[PDB]
Design a protein around this nucleic acid. Structure first.
Ligand SMILES: [Mg+2]
Lengths: 53, 294, 231, 66
RNA sequence: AAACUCCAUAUAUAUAAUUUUAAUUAUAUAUAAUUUUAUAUUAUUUAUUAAUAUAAAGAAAGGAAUUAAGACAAAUCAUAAUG
């Protein structure tokens, strides 16, 4: 499945609603998500050692 | 209970006192009244029957089966109005319903703004005042069924505030084209998106985007260049707030797919200077803007 | 100080928030009183379970959203709480269950115990086809009169006479009662079986413990078959 | 219960959030103060039809809740 | 649409100065069932379940009306009506 973009950018899409005025009131989650950014890299990571042996 | 004439004469009219006196001399005080469970003679509410109700009683002077006046003594000589208006407030408006006093003052934009606010929480004022709607495709489609060809109206519209926010909406209705446009206007507001704009007038660089069979080649333009693009792209740029743009469409020139392709290109094919700088850890300078700075 | 609008029920986002909230309240009681023993007279099948009807519960349990299986789940928990030992039950359980008990107390029944009249006679009416019969049963020695005439005179068919005797044969009281039967309408078969039905209904006053045997024999059931206009 | 939140354990009705007015409009809302105590103020029919959207959704089994 | 219903059936109340007598009746109103309950067995998706039997309770066992669409350009210009 394609790497989704819209689930991790709710803060940025919401911020456009507030700046334009389409959304009058800031949501309660808005401040919490802004202070705790989601991880949005979704990359494959190399590994150089077998942790067991 | 039997009451003295004095008491009864302070509540009931004199004309009715004789009847009350005769009834209190014929019905013994120890009468045990029984309730009839076959025939309901009296009304379901209490009533002394001393006053004639203007609505629930027969109108005095009107002819009817139980009219007591002689046929030459009726007093209804005007027949242009309803004789017995409704009682009380004068209406039977169901609780929770409003009198349709004004019709045609309803605005499809205001109907979209009210419904969307209740369904999604968007501000009605912004929709009814800040947004501009432009139909892009309006055609009739048909489905072949056993009963016969069923026609439907298809409407593709674009909405935007001319300040970066633009949305595309589609709507279908078997009844009329106006209903299809209302649904498309409703859908477009729900799909509103922000598009990056360089200096709030144009796009960042050039875009070569493929949306299905549509090949879109969009080039950024100098200030005052204007919109020199396919007519479908022109309308979207107007709503989105793009003022300067050049470009060509190759292969498929289907209006519907050009509009969707353009919206997709403006979001998925652009990168702001700020986003490029942060990703690369470099400073990007607009030479033209620096040349006119202090 | 600042005020906000929030869903009333914790189950707001469920399919039937009203039913789920009620089930949760009952489930809490069944958890808090898990240890309380249940009635051992439940084996004796205590005849107490006046629970509200599915339609009545739909007023409080989501209306159209209410599903039959959801109503079945409410009854399984209402009965389990109800079947807790009466001595060891508490107010909390009874209060919660009170809201689910059907209410038909404002009105009363219309049935008055049947008793023998001033002359020791049990009077019952019976109907079969177009015939009707009013019988007077008294304690006696087996004497029968039909419309003032001897049984063999009025009813020529022995099968009709045997039908009249059958209810008395079931309770083995053929020689213990005198019957004065009066009948009108229909024919011999309708009248004989209308008398049969009326004797069975009149014999219950003398010993109400034999009603079950009369019902099982089929003599207390009114035959509904009548001539039907062809359609 | 311990977060003064909400839960759904039986079935997520498709459209609960996007079609909230046709699914959740009939259910009752309430006004509460900063202490989460019911204010008891009667709500206008306008306030009782507005979508009440969750601020945060926690999903235990996302593979079955696409 | 089903149904709700109306009819039939069972019962209750009211009415009849029981010679308009059929009071074993007449006809108004209301009630009742789409029956219910437990028990063993057999299957199950085994559960807050079905198919059976069994005991218990009950008078309780039957009908109705109407239409949603479309076809036969089926009958009727002689039931009447129109070009
Ligand atoms: Mg008589």
């Amino acid at each position: 499945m394609k790497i989704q973009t819209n689930a991790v950018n709710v803060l940025q899409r919401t911020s456009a609603y507030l700046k334009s005025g389409l959304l009058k009131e800031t949501p309660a989650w808005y401040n919490v998500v802004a202070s705790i950014p989601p991880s949005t890299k979704f990359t494959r990571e190399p590994r150089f050692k077998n942790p067991s042996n | 209970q039997h009451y003295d004439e004095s008491l009864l004469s302070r509540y009931y009219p004199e004309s009715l006192l004789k009847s009350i006196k005769l009834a209190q001399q014929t019905i013994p005080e120890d009468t045990k009244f029984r309730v009839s469970r076959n025939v309901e003679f009296a009304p379901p509410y209490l009533d002394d029957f001393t006053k004639i109700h203007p609505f629930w009683d027969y109108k005095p002077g009107m002819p009817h089966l139980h009219a007591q006046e002689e046929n030459n003594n009726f007093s209804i000589f005007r027949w242009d109005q309803v004789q017995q208006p409704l009682p009380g407030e004068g209406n039977i408006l169901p609780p929770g319903v409003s009198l349709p006093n004004d019709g045609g003052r309803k605005s499809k934009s205001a109907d979209v703004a009210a419904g969307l606010h209740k369904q999604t929480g968007v501000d009605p004022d912004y929709i009814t005042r800040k947004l501009t709607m432009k139909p892009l495709v309006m055609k009739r489609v048909s489905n072949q069924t056993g009963k016969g060809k069923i026609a439907s109206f298809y409407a593709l519209v674009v909405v935007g505030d001319k300040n970066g926010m633009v949305g595309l909406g589609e709507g279908k209705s078997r009844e009329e084209m106006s209903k299809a446009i209302f649904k498309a206007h409703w859908d477009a507001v729900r799909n509103l998106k922000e598009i990056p704009r360089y200096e709030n007038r144009t796009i960042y660089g050039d875009i070569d985007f493929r949306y299905h069979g549509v090949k879109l080649h969009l080039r950024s333009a100098k200030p005052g260049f204007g919109l020199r693009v396919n007519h479908v792209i022109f309308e979207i740029c107007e709503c989105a707030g793009i003022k300067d743009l050049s470009g060509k469409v190759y292969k498929s020139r289907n209006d519907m797919n050009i509009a969707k392709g353009t919206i997709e290109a403006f979001t998925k094919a652009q990168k702001t200077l700020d986003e490029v700088a942060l990703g690369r850890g470099k400073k990007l300078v607009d030479v033209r803007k620096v040349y006119y700075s202090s | 100080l600042p005020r906000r609008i929030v869903p009333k029920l914790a189950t707001f986002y469920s399919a039937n928030p009203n039913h789920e909230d009620r089930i949760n309240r009952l489930e809490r009681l069944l958890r808090k009183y898990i240890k309380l023993p249940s009635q051992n007279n439940n084996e004796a099948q205590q005849t107490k379970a006046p629970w509200i009807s599915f339609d009545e519960y739909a007023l409080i349990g989501g209306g159209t959203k209410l599903k039959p299986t959801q109503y079945t789940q409410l009854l399984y928990m209402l009965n389990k709480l109800h079947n807790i030992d009466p001595q060891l039950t508490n107010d909390e359980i009874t209060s919660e269950l009170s809201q689910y008990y059907k209410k038909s107390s404002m009105l009363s029944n219309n049935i008055k115990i049947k008793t023998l009249d001033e002359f020791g006679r049990s009077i019952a009416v019976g109907k079969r086809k177009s015939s009707t019969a009013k019988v007077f049963v008294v304690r006696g020695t087996g004497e029968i009169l039909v419309n003032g005439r001897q049984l063999n005179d009025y009813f020529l068919k022995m099968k009709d006479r045997e039908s009249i005797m059958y209810p008395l044969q079931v309770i083995e009281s053929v020689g213990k009662y005198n019957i004065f039967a009066t009948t009108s309408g229909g024919g011999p078969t309708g009248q004989a079986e209308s008398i049969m039905h009326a004797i069975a209904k009149a014999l219950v006053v003398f010993n109400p413990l034999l009603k079950s045997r009369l019902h099982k024999a089929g003599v207390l059931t009114r035959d509904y078959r009548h001539v039907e206009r062809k359609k | 219960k311990k977060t003064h939140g909400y839960y759904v354990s039986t079935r997520w009705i498709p459209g609960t959030l996007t079609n909230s007015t046709e699914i959740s409009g009939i259910w009752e809302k309430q006004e509460i103060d900063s202490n989460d105590n019911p204010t008891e103020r009667a709500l206008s029919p306008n306030e009782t039809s507005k979508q009440v959207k969750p601020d945060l959704l926690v999903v235990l089994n996302p593979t079955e809740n696409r």
